[PDB]
């Protein structure tokens, strides 16, 4: 399972990349417009992320019509080979994904909330599909069940579109995504940061240090 | 999973094909009789659908006897390489299917209501079998259960006949068909249209637009 | 399980009540607006339904604010002892329900789409809660799953609010509701009519008649 | 579980009654008209069965209209206190059951093929409901699954109508009915006869006889 | 799943073969003895079936001893390359099967009533094994349970012997055999004919034809 | 299931109480310390919540030693009959709970992270036990699993301690708690407000209102 | 599944081999010592079984120490290429198995009572492992449970050691072993004989004979 | 499944190696420091274990920082081709693992307590991942459930990192690891010794000895 960072915050991205555990980044118009304030320009933020991140970087079109979507998609793709064009689940969006896939431009269908939307995105040829689990949780449905159905459907038809679990809010979305077999999860920075940690790791290391001091007062390992 | 449109309404067909999400069309004598009104001739309608749809188009024979069925079948096939001959689950119908399969004419056995009828059609060599889930719902049986059994039976024997779920009434027939692994669903146009939609997709788009306006008054993505 | 008719069509109501299989009626502002045409007044229609149905009749308030809701509720209640006030799942609606329950006015909380909304309505003291299964099917979730969860939750807490399955579209919603154990279903008239029917009932009757003619030409039972 | 004999053959009935294992009898127009030949009159057959059988005897009305059904039902009931009036699952039949139940005349709703038909019969007040399992088997559906759903539904609502499994064709319908918890099964004579038998019973008795002869050459037990 | 006819009635066999749905025939001494009356001789009956059926025809030996079984088997095989020799599950029978399998004579082990008998037959080299589901039903065990165990056992050891479900009494034996994945079912004629039929098929056909007459008075499809 | 608010923010508490859906409040030292700024004193905050909330209000001791815990508990209890003393799962805490329970002072054992800790708290006499589901989610364990085990354990021994699910982060913690049958959930304000909401509720309301204006221009319901 | 006979009785072995259903033989020191009485010598018994049985014959060492076990194993192996050396699950036994496996002497680890003992034997390279199901039944544990776990473990690691189910006491140990998929069962003679038999096989044969006499008073099949 | 010994006690290691059932050794700073007393030096202990054990020997770094961990890892690697470098699950540790893997130095990530930590270790390229089951048991969670989830995760993504179950306390951790399909278990010496043992093995050997003495007084097997 690939782990992407779901943010447009360049500091968070630099930190996660230096950790070595970030395989890519997803953004959306809200995430970018949050960072593009007090003089900072959205085009610069997007370019900087593309520069910093070695793996895929998803950037969402803002046009709602087919032609504008395809035009924006081509600009995005032209920014770097790792850019992936995020396109919403709409009629025009499916048309745009079909066209872009024929042009070998990588795409990510977003704002997916049920498994048949995900299947339609796959049938249009989309590289990644992003079902939103936390927004479904928000409205009182366990969003992970949609992931489980998508995985079954995609397995049934040997679908090559990658399942990218999005709207992730906690580490159990991540755990359940891995047990189901989702291809990718994209996670906010807070969540990402907690994935490496456990109190018994901290406690065990502390006791190892203490015990080692008994035979090596300076705490080193001389071999 | 392939998605066919279940209608003979030309406008519906044009529009769905235009959305790029329609992989073929099924008709039957009722759907067609519905369109062949006010001077419109059934032959013109059938030829037009063959013309504008790239994928399979199912057209049903009206004869009830073996010889009439094969004669009408050969005419339907002669109309275009994408024509599929729809033939009812009857004794004469199974014989017709065997003959037509020997002649490399594609066939779709219809009016199937249980799994052993579907198996018999497959044994005759039929290209598609069409169990009617909504009509089973109508008589107080969950029609999807028949689709699950047919999928198991066909898996057991590596049967190449495609399961084409028909008499679809709602998007949960579609969802359950995809989780089971049916090869095709055929859907009325209103159902087709509903499959792309979700209130959280609309709401998420609206919010992305509103947030983007904060940093781009013209609401465009200039890169 | 009680079976209500979901309509404001007087003829439908008369006929279903005449069949003796209808235990009450639910309306909403759309169903009524449909009937209040060509000089027919909504007030006359509501009063007439109250008059001819012996069981509960649900009538929805149109105000969106607490005070308007309780005023309209008290009027609806004042129309007959069988009137049940339908009130939407909103903040103002929950407050209205609590007040009205304190006043021993029967209530039905409507536009419920998940199990915790249903639990909140029950906690307000509502007499019936109405989850909308067909509208959930429309957005690609199996609505019956929500009914199962509500039945479990209400069993866990010995909740006395009746589960009234609404937005019913087919006889399998009805069948699954009865297997789950919902207290009530409300059904459109076409659905109601289909519930009595089965092709093997018709065929069995025909055969009994034909066999009886063999020993009684007049086809009667003379004892 | 009560075991009824499903026949109008008076010899079969006399035999099963003398076995001591027959708790009642069901008939239908086909079963009676089969026996009422070569001079034998249907009224005499019905009277003879009522005389012979101590338990319930179901006799079906032939009228299809409410008034005729109720008139015939009253004649049937007047033939003896153990008569039960069999009435088909139709609109008029439900009306007739309601009326008869209010008149304390025992009723049996027949030609039931799904669980919601059975529920409607129960709601009309019917004493027994008879789902037909073998006729469902005939059309490629496992009829026992309907019994299982009816039992769950009736348990959910503490329904007092007895489930009378009919159209029984083999001893496994009987076994499964007992494991499900159906109140009654009605069985053809062939089936009834096989229920007491097993080859290991025969073999065990034979070996007991043989072994006993060793210590009592005349085969008796003198105590 | 292959479907054989279980009968020695030439008219039934001709009829089913002409339907195109019969893949072979099984006979036994009782079945043949029923037809070999009023002058008809068993040898002619056997030869006539072998001539009419292109697929396997199973004919049972009558000897109970190894040498007689093997001699009769060689005669049976001498009647045609489609003859299959039916041999009972006995010590002599297993020896005969082993010898015949070495001689490349196809064999069918019959009178099997549990899964370990079926495994012993497979280990002797038998081509088909026939567990008798109806006769288990007769003694109060669900016979299909035995088919499911045999399927699992044969799958575990990659056994090439075909499971031929025999003593079939109804269409649910056939349905369950297909869902389990038995290789062959052999069915009496009454059962076979019922497999193609369903009331909704007839009803749907009738409605299509009625609708078609609206646009084509002669009921024709002219293309 | 009772629903408490997990906060010490007076405005949130006033708002939720005025909604009529809040059955009590839980606080902890972090929550209170967040509000006790810019002059506001913790004592006033505690007393103000006790005055506003008619239901239980849980207030945590700060002493880590038995004697201090018991003294603080008695002060807390002295503030009002609805005060519940929150005491951590520690050796001292269990001793304090046992003493306080004997004194008829209501108690809430907090900082519980597995089912055996919850059982120890129940055995000390505690009124409520609060397992922390979100903090388990944080370290990569599905916290709801622990609630399910505690429910089963408490049911086995007919334990009267209430399960109060704490550290709730989303509406699915609440849904799952209700399906499990936890006695109480305590939720932060953001979560609480989201529980009443669903997009289909808003959409349905809007459509009803639009339809009603068709028959009542002023949007009124005059009865 | 291979079926071995578990005995040292030469008459039983000769009978079973002559039946054609015995694939090999296991012995142990108790079984041999039982036969080696009244002047019969164990060396003679061992050699005679090796001579009679085509397949594997397991003969157990008596030494408890590594060097003696390996020496005795070499003597056993020298008796015939079908001899398999039975070695107990002990520390020295595992050493002996590893050595003998390196010398290409086939081995069978015996006295195994749980799945991890079986795993250790496999890791030593043993040809067969013999878990003892009946001695586990004797002490109130269902011994077939360990067969199931051993099958799963060996499947997980693609282990080549054959599972040889031993201490078999009845035909249901055999049935369950085949359904699990054990490689081999070794059975006492009484059990072996019972596997071919069933009362309905006997009954069925008798009836076929009787019916055949009708068309052939000879009892012959002339073809 | 590989079985390693979890100790730094040379006598235990020597004994287990000599038994031939030990596939490798894991150590940690606590285990080494326990043995490095009475003048014994950790460098010597480590070297002696590397010398005695043919299989993998895991030796833990003591630095907490990337640079020092990588330096120590290269020293450890330098000691012998069978050295595996044990590195804790920390940010620095994942960085070190990635570096060492790129240098083809075998690694074992330790102090893992949930499945997502294990997944992060696998994504860094680690050779072995060691989840600690007994320490999870110590805090009231069944640690084996974590192994089951890791096995499913690794199977989903075809992960080559071996699952090395650590912190093992009893033989049922071993049995459940084998049934799940973990690649390796590492076990303390007292657990390792109990794995070969069972009371029925001892009892069966004693009885075989006694029975054999009856036919060979010296207890020998002369062949
Ligand atoms: C290395 C990782 O495989 C091992 O030596 C572990 O540190 C121990 O297995 C941990 O066990 P304890 O919980 O008993 O320290
Ligand atoms: C052909 C078979 O795939 C289809 O056109 C079917 O006739 C319809 O899907 C049946 O649907 P209705 O039950 O709505 O006629
Ligand atoms: C009142 C609540 O029981 C009912 O009239 C509901 O409004 C309808 O059942 C909703 O059905 P639709 O989804 O068809 O409007
Ligand atoms: C792109 C799709 O993978 C992402 O940036 C999604 O928009 C977010 O993951 C959605 O998360 P929120 O529900 O928190 O906006
Ligand atoms: C009365 C209802 O209990 C019965 O006589 C039924 O009509 C028969 O049991 C139906 O059986 P068939 O399907 O064999 O007619
Ligand atoms: C041969 C074995 O496949 C068949 O002819 C069997 O004898 C029959 O299928 C047995 O059926 P009955 O139990 O109905 O005799
Ligand atoms: C008291 C126990 O019911 C509560 O106030 C708890 O402390 C909180 O629910 C803990 O939640 P956080 O993990 O969000 O602090
Ligand atoms: C050798 C190992 O396969 C066999 O001879 C076993 O010793 C016996 O199967 C053990 O059976 P008992 O428990 O009945 O002695």
From Swiss-Prot, chains A, B, C, D, E, F, G, H:
The active site is at residue 86. One of its GO terms (cellular component) is cytoplasm. The keyword Disulfide bond does not apply. Pathway: Carbohydrate degradation; pentose phosphate pathway; D-glyceraldehyde 3-phosphate and beta-D-fructose 6-phosphate from D-ribose 5-phosphate and D-xylulose 5-phosphate (non-oxidative stage): step 2/3. Its EC number is 2.2.1.2. InterPro entries: Aldolase_TIM, TAL/FSA, Transaldolase_3B, Transaldolase_3B/F6P_aldolase, Transaldolase_AS, TSA/FSA_arc/bac. The keyword Secreted does not apply. It is found in: Cytoplasm. CDD domains: Transaldolase_FSA. GO terms for biological process: carbohydrate metabolic process; pentose-phosphate shunt. It is an enzyme of class 2 (transferase). It catalyses: D-sedoheptulose 7-phosphate + D-glyceraldehyde 3-phosphate = D-erythrose 4-phosphate + beta-D-fructose 6-phosphate. Keywords: Cytoplasm, Pentose shunt, Schiff base, Transferase. It comes from the Archaea. One of its GO terms (molecular function) is transaldolase activity. Transaldolase is important for the balance of metabolites in the pentose-phosphate pathway. NCBIfam families: fsa_talC_mipB (TIGR00875). This is Probable transaldolase. It comes from Thermoplasma acidophilum (strain ATCC 25905 / DSM 1728 / JCM 9062 / NBRC 15155 / AMRC-C165).
């Amino acid at each position: 399972m690939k782990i992407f960072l779901d943010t447009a915050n360049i500091d968070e991205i630099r930190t996660g990349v230096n950790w070595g555990i970030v395989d890519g980044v997803t953004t959306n118009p809200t995430l970018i417009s949050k960072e593009a304030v007090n003089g900072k320009k959205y085009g610069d933020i997007i370019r900087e992320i593309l520069k910093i991140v070695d793996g895929p970087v998803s950037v969402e079109v803002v046009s709602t019509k087919y032609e504008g979507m395809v035009e924006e998609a081509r600009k995005i793709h032209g920014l770097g080979d790792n850019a992936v064009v995020k396109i919403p689940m709409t009629e025009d969006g499916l048309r745009a994904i079909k066209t872009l896939s024929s042009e070998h431009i990588n795409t990510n269908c977003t704002l997916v909330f049920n498994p048949i939307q995900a299947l339609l995105a796959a049938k249009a040829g989309v590289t990644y599909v992003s079902p939103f689990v936390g927004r479904l949780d928000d409205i009182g449905e366990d969003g992970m069940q949609i992931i489980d159905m998508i995985r079954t459907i995609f397995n049934n038809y040997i679908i090559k579109t990658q399942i990218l679990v999005a709207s992730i809010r906690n580490p159990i979305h991540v755990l359940r995504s891995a047990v189901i077999g989702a291809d990718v999860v994209t996670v906010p920075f807070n969540v990402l940061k907690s994935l490496m940690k456990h109190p018994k790791t901290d406690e065990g290391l502390a006791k190892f240090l203490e015990d080692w001091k008994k035979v090596s007062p300076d705490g080193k390992l001389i071999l």
